[PDB]
Structures are given as C-alpha cells and as structure tokens.
Paper text:
Aim: Bifidobacterium longum subsp. infantis uses a glycoside hydrolase (GH) family 42 β-galactosidase (BiBga42A) for hydrolyzing lacto-N-tetraose (LNT), which is the most abundant core structure of human milk oligosaccharides (HMOs). As such, BiBga42A represents one of the pivotal enzymes underpinning the symbiosis between bifidobacteria and breastfed infants. BiBga42A has a three-dimensional structure similar to other GH42 enzymes that have three domains consisting of a (β/α)8 barrel (domain A), an α/β fold (domain B), and an anti-parallel β-sandwich (domain C). Glu-160 and Glu-318 in BiBga42A were predicted to be the acid/base catalyst and the nucleophile, respectively, based on previous studies of GH42 enzymes and sequence alignment.
First, we determined the structure of the WT enzyme complexed with glycerol (WT-GOL) at 1.7 Å resolution. The electron density of a glycerol molecule, which was used as a cryoprotectant, was observed at the active site, even though the crystals were grown in the presence of Gal. The asymmetric unit of the WT-GOL crystal contained one molecule of BiBga42A, and it forms a homotrimer with symmetry-related molecules by a crystallographic 3-fold axis. A PISA molecular interface analysis calculated that approximately 27% of the entire surface area of the trimer (17,082 Å of 64,278 Å) was buried. Our previous study using calibrated gel filtration chromatography also suggested that BiBga42A forms a trimer in solution. The trimeric structure of BiBga42A resembles a flowerpot, like other GH42 enzymes. The glycerol molecule in WT-GOL occupies the C2-C4 position of the Gal.
Numbering used by the authors:
A (entry chain A), B (entry chain A): 1 to 691
Write the structure that this text describes.
Amino acid sequence: MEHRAFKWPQPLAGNKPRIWYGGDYNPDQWPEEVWDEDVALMQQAGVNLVSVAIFSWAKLEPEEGVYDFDWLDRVIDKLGKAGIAVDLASGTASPPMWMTQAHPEILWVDYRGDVCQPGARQHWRATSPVFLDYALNLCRKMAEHYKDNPYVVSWHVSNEYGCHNRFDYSEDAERAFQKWCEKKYGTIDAVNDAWGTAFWAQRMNNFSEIIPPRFIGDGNFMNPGKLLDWKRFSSDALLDFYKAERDALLEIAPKPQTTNFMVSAGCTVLDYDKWGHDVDFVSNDHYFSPGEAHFDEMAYAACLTDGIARKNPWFLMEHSTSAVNWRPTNYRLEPGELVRDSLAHLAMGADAICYFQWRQSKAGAEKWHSAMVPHAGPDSQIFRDVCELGADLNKLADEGLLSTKLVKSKVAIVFDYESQWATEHTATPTQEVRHWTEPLDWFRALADNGLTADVVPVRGPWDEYEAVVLPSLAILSEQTTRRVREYVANGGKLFVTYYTGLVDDRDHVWLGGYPGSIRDVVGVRVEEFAPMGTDAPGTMDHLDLDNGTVAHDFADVITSVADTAHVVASFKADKWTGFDGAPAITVNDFGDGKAAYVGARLGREGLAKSLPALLEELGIETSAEDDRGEVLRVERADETGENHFVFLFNRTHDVAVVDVEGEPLVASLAQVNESEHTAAIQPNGVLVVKL
Amino acid sequence: MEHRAFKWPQPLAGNKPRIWYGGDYNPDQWPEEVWDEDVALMQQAGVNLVSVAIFSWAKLEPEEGVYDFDWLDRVIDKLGKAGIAVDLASGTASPPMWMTQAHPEILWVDYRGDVCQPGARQHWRATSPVFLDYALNLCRKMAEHYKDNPYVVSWHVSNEYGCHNRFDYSEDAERAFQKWCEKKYGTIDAVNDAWGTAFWAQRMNNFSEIIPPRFIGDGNFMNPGKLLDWKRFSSDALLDFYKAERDALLEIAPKPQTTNFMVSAGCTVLDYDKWGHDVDFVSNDHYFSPGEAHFDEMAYAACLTDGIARKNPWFLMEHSTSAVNWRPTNYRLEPGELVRDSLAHLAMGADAICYFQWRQSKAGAEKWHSAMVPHAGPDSQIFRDVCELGADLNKLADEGLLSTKLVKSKVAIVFDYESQWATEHTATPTQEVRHWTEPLDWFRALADNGLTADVVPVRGPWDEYEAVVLPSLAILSEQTTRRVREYVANGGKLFVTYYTGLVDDRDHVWLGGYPGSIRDVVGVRVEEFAPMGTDAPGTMDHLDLDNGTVAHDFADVITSVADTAHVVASFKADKWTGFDGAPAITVNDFGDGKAAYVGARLGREGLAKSLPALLEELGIETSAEDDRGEVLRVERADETGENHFVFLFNRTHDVAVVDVEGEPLVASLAQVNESEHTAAIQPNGVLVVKL
C-alpha cells in the first residue's frame, strides 16, 4: 500500500506561499451584488482561498445535458482578480431533483428496504452504475471548462463521502458485496471459515448466498464477521467511487486534489488511514466536542490527522467559528476559542485553515450553523476574530512556519478504524466498551503528565517510537502481533490495556487465555472478563485499585503473572467478588523491552494518576515541574531545526504561567513579560514562540 | 387438557441411572481432531449426555434433497463408545441459506410488512406450509437414520420456539389467525363481542375482516382483545408446529422427547404451562438475572419450572457457566456461583443439569458466550468447577436423589401467562405494572420470612394448598373465580393484590367495583386506581403506610370494607390526596377461610415487612428464628420419605450459620463442624444434607 506523491495547492502567479485561509463559499445562495461585498470582506479578513461549487449540481447542470457555468466563471474571476485562490469542487456531492426523479434507482436503500428520498443531501448509492455515469460526466465537463483557469489551484472531490450514504442495502450493494468478498477471499469456503458459518446454519454453497446484513428483527444478533466485512466493503465501495471521480478530473485537468475527511476521536465511518493513501494531500473536517473535552479532543483529532498524513503538512478544510446546527444542543464557542481552535490545528501540522462557511445561510437546513460572516454581519465579534486570525496566519508564514512538521513524540498511541468496527458488534462483553475512547483517554492522561503523544494509525510507523500504547486495540492480526512482539523484544516500551488483542482480523478469538497472541509479551493470562455497570440493583459498578484509582465498566480476571513480571497495582474489593488482591496493573520484562498491562478501564483521571509509576518503570522521562499538565506543548520544526516553533495552550480554567524560550510571535488571551521572560495564559489562551 | 405420559431419557445399555450432566455440543464448528479431545475432557468432567445437531441443517442437508450424515454418525459413535449419551436434535431449528434463497415465502414478516432476513437464526414463519414440509422431511430423514442407534436416548425437537419468530404478520399468519378465531369462537358475532368491536367502528361482517394487529401508527392503541388473542394464537401456532415435528419423529423413531422452554420470571413468549402438556418431560433454559436478584429469581424460575412439570422431575437443558453474550453488559458469575446455580435447579427438582455450551465458539455471534471449555481451555477455573460439579452430581445420585420430588410448600404463588399478556396493553392504568413482577416479589418476601413457596401455574392444583397468592393476577375467568370463591369458603387462606381480577379471559372488565368477580371474598370495594410515578414535576410518587412500609407505582382507592373484614394497615398522606387514613391492607372472613387484600405495590421489602402480621392473621406458621430469611431451604423427598434431601443456600453477603440435621453430602463455600453439628455458609455457598 503506497501513498500518492504529495502535492499541495500552489500560489496564484505572482503570490508567495501562505498558510491558506478561508472557507466554503456559496455565492449561488445569494444575489450577485452580495458577491462584490464578499470579496471586499475577504480581503479585509486576509482570506486567500475559498472552496466553491460543492453542492452546486442543480445550478451547474439545471436539466440533463444542459450546462450553465457562466455564474461560476464570473465569481471565480472576481475572486482571482482580488488575489483569492479557488479550491474548486467537482460539484458531484449531491444530485439534483431532475436526476433522482428520472432515476429512482440512484437512491440508497436502508436495512429494512426503505428508500432514502431527496430533501437533504448525498442520497445516492456508492455502487450505482447510473449515478457513477452522471458524476463522471459532470467531473469531465468541470475539468474541461476549468483546465486552464489561472485561479483554480486545487480540486475538492465530492464532499465527506459516507457521512450519509455509508450503508446501502440495495440490489446494487448486494451484487457489489458478493464481488468484494470473492475478490478478498477467493473461495466461498474461505468466506464460510472467516465468518464462522457452521454456527446457526449459515454455511453458503456459493457467492450468490452472500447477502447484506439487512433487517433480522431488532435486537437479534447479526453474523459478526459479516458485519465487520460489511463496514470494510462500505468504506471500499466509496473509495472506489472517489478514485474514479479523481481520475476523471485528473485525466483532463491535473491539479492537486483531495477529498475532505471527518477525522475525530469518535468518527469511524471510513477507514480514513486507508483513504489517506489516495489523496494528494490530507484534508479534514473537525468540529468541537462540547464541554470539558473540547480542547483535548480537538488536539487529539488534529494529531491523528497528522498521523494519517505521515507527518506531511495537511489541510483543515472545515471547522466552525462558533455553534454548529446538527447537535441536539448547539453550544457556542467562548471568547478566544475561535483563534485558539484554529491555532490548535495549525500546531498539529496544518498549513491551511478553513471554515464551513464564509457567509451564514439565511435559509435551509444549516441556517443556524455559524460562519465567518454571521447573520449579524461584519460588525460582529466573530468577524473581528476572523480578521485577527487572518493577520496571525500571515505573521506565522512570514516567520517560516510553512512546511515545518509536527515533531516526533516519545509516545505513539495506536488507532485502528477496524478495531473500532469490531467493538461495535451487539454481542460483545459490553456495549459500554468501544475502541475509540481508550486512545483519547491516554492522550489526555499523558498530557496531564507533561507529555504530548503522537497518534499513529496501526498501519503507520508506531514501532519506530520510544514507547507505544495499544488502547483497547481489539484486533491484533498475525502481522500486528509480530510487529508488537518484535518491537518489545528489541527494547521497545509498550502499554497494553483491557480489550486489546481479543481477536484476529477475521474476528476469530485468539484462544488459550487473553490476550491470546501476546500473553507472553505482557506476562499475564486473562481467563475471563468482569464487565461492570448499573443496569439492575446490586450490579458490580466499580473496582477500587490500591494505587488510589477506581475502575469502571470493565476489568480483566488475571489468573497468572509471569516470573518476569510484577504487579504494580491490585484491586481491592468485597471478598465474594473474587477481585480482592487480584492483579490490576502489571509490568513485564520481555527481551530487552518492557510491557505494562492495564487490566481495567481507569478513565482519563485513573490513567493520569497511574502513569507516574508506569512512566518511571518504563524509563520514559517527563518534566519534574508540578504544573506540567496545565498546558499542552505542541512543536513544529523543519528538518534542519533552523525554524522551530512552540505552541502553548492552556488546558485549564486557571491562569497558567509559562517560560518564554524564544521570540513571541502570536498571543491570544496571553500576556508576555519581557523582563522575566514569562507569560500568563488566560483560560482559552495560547502563545506561539519561535526558538 | 391431559398431560402426556411422563417419559425420561434412559441410560445407555450397561449404565446405571445418573443425574444427566453435559451441554449443547457443536462438533461441526471444529476440525475433527478436536472431537477426540472433547470426548477425553467430557470423561474428566463426568459429562454423561450432550445435545447435538441443534443448528446443523446446513451440514445435514447441504443442498435440497442431499443428506450428509456421516460426520454425525462418527461423532455419535465416539461419544457412545466413551459412555456418553446423545440427546439428538431434529436439526430443524433454523433453515439453510439455499432454502430461504429458493423460498423467500418462508421468512417471517414484521408488523410494518418488513421481511426478516437470514443472518441470525429462526427466521421462519410458524404458519408457512412450505417450511413445515421442509422441517417434517428432515425430521423423517433423521428419525429413519437414527431409529436403531444405541447411543441416542432422546429427541431435542427444534430449539426455543418463538425466541425470535413468536410474531409473524405475513399472509400465512393472516389466514391462520382467521381460522384460529373461527375455531375458538364459532361465529363472527362472538368475535365482535369478545373484542368489543362496537367501539371505534371495528365491527366485522365475516371472518375475512379479521386482520393481524399490524402497524397502526406508533403510539396508537390496538384493539386489546385482538392483541390478547394474537398472543394466544402465536403461541398455539408454534405449538401446532412443535406437535407436527414431534409426531413425525415419533412415528419412525419413538424415544423420549422434549422441546426446550425459556421459563424465567419475566419471559412469557409462549404459554409454557400449556406447552408442558405436549412434552414427554419438561426441559428449561434459564440464564441468571444480573445483580441482587440473581439467586432468588433463578430459584423462583426453577420453582415455576417444577410447577409446570406438576412436580415430576424436569431437565435443565441450558444455563451458563459464566457470562452470556446477549445483554448490553454481560456480567460474569462470581466464585462458587457455577456450582451453586446448578444445585439451585437441582434442588427445585431437576434430574439433569446441562449448559449452553460444551466448547466456547471462537467465531460467530455467540463467541463471547461462556462455555464449559472456555476460550482459555481446560486450564481454567471454569473447567475445574465443571469437573467438581460433575463429581458432586455423581455423589448425589449414589445417595438416592434421582426421582425424588420437590416437597409441597404451605404456599402456592399463582402464575398466569395470559394475565401477563393482558397487562401488556398500552392503554392500561399504568405501563409500570405488569403481572410478572408481583409473584416474584412474593416469592422473595416469603423467603425473607422463612418460607419457600411453590410457584403454581393457574391451571395447576393451587387450590390444594394451605395458602394461595393471587399476585397482580389481572385475569379471573368465570372458572378461576369459582375456584377462588370455593377455595376460601371451604377454609383456604388467600392473599390478593392490586391489579387482580380486573377482567375476564376476554379482557372485559368485571363491573360494580374492583375486583369485580370476588369483591365479597376480599371484603373490599375499589372504585378507582391511583397510579404513581415521577413523569412530571409534582406527580404523586409514593404513599406511606402506617405499618412502616411505602407504596410505589400503584394504589387502590378502597371505598368500603365488609363487616366481616378489618383494616390491618392504612395509608398516611397529605389530606388533599384523599388517601390519609384510607385502607391499604385488609383481612376478611369468608366462609371458613380468610382473604387478605394488599391494595398497593409494596415491593419485596414492603411485603417482607408486612407479612409477619398477615401470616399470623391467616394462621400460617413459620420459624421463630431471627435469621430465618438468611438461607433458602429447599427440600426433595421420595414418596415414602426414606430419601429426604435438604439444600441450604445463602441468600446474603454475610456468613450464614445453620444446623446440620443429617449427613452432609455436598458443600460449596461451606464448612461443617461435626462437633457442634453446624455449618458456616459463605456468600454464594450451599450445603446439601440427607436426613
């Protein structure tokens, strides 16, 4: 699996490279007089790039085989004459009404056989031959028309594939899933073994007896190997679609191209790491998580984006100035968070910072989604902040930030889209445990101990790191198992948690005691699990540990510990539970390395309090400073090290004081004292320094 | 309604009778080399019976009209040569893919018209002519092939009928429900009156205008007489199917036969009491309820199983060594509970103890369901415990337990599958009240007072008992009413609760004041109900009683008390409610007997605290010992009384001390002191003594 050669949208002729800054722009929603005010405000704000025509199919092709590009030619000329570059869409993200009215077979079908109608967006089947023909046609018409346009710097292919059309249960998807399985497994016998079909009379005679995981009565249990493969197939089918659109544009009008991802701690619609191999550059859409997780989760998501990009610069295609429209309660951003959030992504390696969207819609389903120009207009705190950010990004580019890379951490936290999928089955030990929460909890606990981790996809080079976290990494394939065993034996330092290595990549259990492929690495054997909760009176809902932490949701029953291992922490419990004095946290010597095993869910707080002991045991150095968890420190450097930037973010609701170890470039809710070379960072503030 | 003659699986030639011990066995999921280890482990564990081929249709009939029995012949020979008997399945529990692909009319249909697909199990219509033909065909092929096999001791017909396919809304079920109604009622006028169809323009001109209770818009109110009959019809339709499979096997290969039930406090998929009339012996599948209810609910379920069996020995076809796969949080068993749970069923009259399943599946939807041989293998606490239980059951059979019966209690708690169904309508006084909880609450409150009740189905001989509980028994037919009135007048002692006797068997209300058919038995008249909860601010959520208990969810408004009755307890409340000083608990003299009325939901705790007074008033004797509720005492005896066994189970999280009134045979987490003839029973422990 090779990545494509890296390509990045280049400046308009006569311009110097900049941190690209701007947003989705939808002039087609407004009368044309508004466009001249849009351009003048964009110049005021320091906007240098916008993404246009994303959902414009019904205007670009208003009837079948009739094209209307003149409006788009005119707005692209206005932008370009003002020095603003265009990231042009294919226009294919969502089909017009004339098309679905004429071709109802385009619409995707749900698990009960109910057809998804128009009225929102992206109501098309990934495996529809007729929709593909319509989409490639528009791609080609667009490419031919814009191939020589001097103001178009990149292609934005479709939009957030799979946000709405991940799953289709049509006859098209039935046929395509049969073909996928044949191309993966080769024989029906191989499919039967993978899916364990001897159970419940599911054994198939040929590929025609492979059906999608349709409606089986709510509450009943779908074949888990088949469900896992369904999610892989669904991601692959949309990848195929993306690659076909891409290729159709590039054959006529080669330009840097991307499609926008939805990388966030809890979003696993697609295997985004896999997809990252087919974009010229990684672009991401991230919106804040409400409440206390806001800052840490956004840093973690931008960190994972950078891991997907293999530390190449990446493109923040979307985020929000303030509230989104799509949550049950759409909380606003607090003062300072607009600037802070943008610099968080920048810190984690973005060389472009863009919003959804330029002007707040006055009608339609996202009218309540914040924008760069709110309903309130340019006389607004949001627009002032947008202008301030624009000046900030010009300064940072003047000072050499472009093309610098996020520095390598001591610690790689491993993330696997497929492990998440495996943990989503409805007949696992507990529905309260999924893969995705554990890596985020580690990121935050490590930050509390003064350490900024890298978040590395399982395919990526986590085995080149000083230390590695396997966080509820439910799948360990034969390959990954080998990589883990070799990494530790050669001197790596490993953290492994509960719900790691239960299964291989077919969702077959590794037998003999969990974790079945690496018991000797971690030097423990688990014979069963003890899920916990409050489902009924008298259920076991927690387990204390003797290091002052508390387990919830899940604990392992460890029945033996290797002679090369020792117990760092033990459970304390009522005797009748069997847990009193049982091992909870262990550390094993394996070859020249070490592996710690955390046999329960301890949360961010439990991990943060357990880590000092474990970091010491594994020889991983951190600050001695008491205030070490108050700020997240994020660094970017060029290869030589001549351009080295430090971003300091307050993670707390107190004022944080930091040393200033170079020239302060940008400050937001932060005050520098030149005398003492110190700075006080308010809540929600950030300071950027060049070393 | 007669029961079939009792028959029980007999020993293999040359063996003596044993408590059958073993589990579901699925060699078809494993390579054949595993089978020789399975047999050797089964011998080590003392396993003497296994149930085979339950879901093996896709291997037994791999294409239409092609049979492959050689694998099954080979594993049955290995088992039998090792002295292990086979409970052979029909194999018909779930159809193969080739069959449903060729015959989509087999699949059951949901209330909206959506067809249940393959991908799990039991996706067939109870009233499908073509599925019946396929099932009877396999039954006959199986019977002909195994009719002279010396190692097959019984038939296990299908599997848990109605677990998944209770309700079908197809055209087949439409036709079959019309015929059922005609065969029940005779005329359409009788159906119209039963269902109250003059209400809401539902009156029918003929049987063709009877339709199933399909989709009527979510939240709207289905005709309740029709819904009640639907549940009776659905149980009958699957009973018809079972009887046809049974008959098809027995015509060729007569052997003891059963089908496995799902008797538990809250499961009412089928009228299991009715079904019990068509099995040769009762077999049950019971899995623990999480938390504090675990022990008491399992004892209660095994007790009800024995009531269904009319005190004949019965067969525990399934339970779990530890966690199941199918709850949202799959809690494990604690140390000692494997042995304890098994002996609980044994205590309540089982002469066979079997698990789902022998070897934990490594793939498929139940891979996370515990087994006798876990993923961890034979070197596991579970497998050791399985071996220990095996030796325990050999000892108890050596000591004469087989064919002894659960001793008659002083108290019969009445259970009615149909009353539960009636309480399930969505326009009852409150959705918080169902029939099934009240009998369980009584069982537990009576145990707290030192009394082990019998749980007797309404058709059964509850009127032969010293005292009887009617626990939220919503239906009283004319017949049951007569039985109650005569039972009390002749000297019976009766407890009646709220939500008893509201309706007759058509769901018509008994008029004139509740409970409308027995007001004079209980010597109270209720004019309305006062449901309670926390649905909105300021709702009435409890009512104190003056005996130190608290009502929740529901109270009766009692407006008069007979001259032959007196008030035992009264509500205390805010004046404006109307409840201050109102009657809550009464006792009436009726003929030579007495009837207590408990006009509210008091819970296990409220009932346990109310019972001393009521037991005294009704002359029902219990221990004077203060510790009387700490252990459940369960007895089995032969008819003479020469073989009398007492099982003592600790119900608490303290150590319980008991007297030893005979020879201790089996102890689990219990220590006997020969000197003092006493024993200390740990939490989760049990002692078995022969008197």
